[PDB]
Amino acid sequence: MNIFEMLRIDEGLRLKIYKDTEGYYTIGIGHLLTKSPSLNAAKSELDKAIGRNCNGVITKDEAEKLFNQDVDAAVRGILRNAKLKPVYDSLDAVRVCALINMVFQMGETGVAGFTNSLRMLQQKRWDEAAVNLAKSRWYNQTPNRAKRVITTFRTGTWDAYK
């Protein structure tokens, strides 16, 4: 297992524009296009991302290209963020994937708001962090995924994905 295989499970693969759990236009492997309610706006973002008229549809290779860009971006977001970098520093090779997974889903700014759970993670209070993350609105909204991500934080194993 690794962050790519983990997120592939949590996001799935869709070659046409759809709406995510927040009702936002999305494509590929969890690639958020826009928060605008306009499908035309989403399509404009897609065409810019790929560099062709996609008509709301992409290939698997195009999805993987975006996916690689998006995991990279999530990592850069963690590394640049004063709240997230210290947490990253305390996370081993498995637990760090749960943090990347959160940033992938919610973004740098969204995840940086989990002040108390983040402090718990930074201090290696795995069980405290897991309890506190459970709870969250995040968990209430997407409990299936959140449970899996929380177990990864708690245990430092891939048990929730296997």
User: What are the residue ranges spanned by the domains of the chain?
Assistant: 1-162
CB 78 within 8 A of CB 109: no
* Cα–Cα dist 66/71, whole Å: 9
Q: What CATH topology corresponds to 1-162?
A: Lysozyme (1.10.530)
**Three-state secondary structure along 6-40?**
HHHHHHCCEEEEEECCCCCEEEECCEEEECCCCHH
CB 72 within 8 A of CB 31: no
Using DSSP, state whether 146 is helix, strand or coil. helix
Who's near 15: CB < 8 A, 6+ residues apart? 27, 28, 57, 58, 59, 60, 63
Is there a binding annotation on residue 79? Answer: no
* Cα–Cα dist 6/158, whole Å: 9
For residue 113, give both structure tokens.
Answer: 């708001």
Q: 127 catalytic, yes or no?
A: no
Is there a binding annotation on residue 32? Answer: yes
Find residue 110's DSSP bridge partners.
none
Who's near 86: CB < 8 A, 6+ residues apart? 122
Q: 45 catalytic, yes or no?
A: no
Is there a binding annotation on residue 66? Answer: no
Residue position matching structure tokens 């706006």: 41
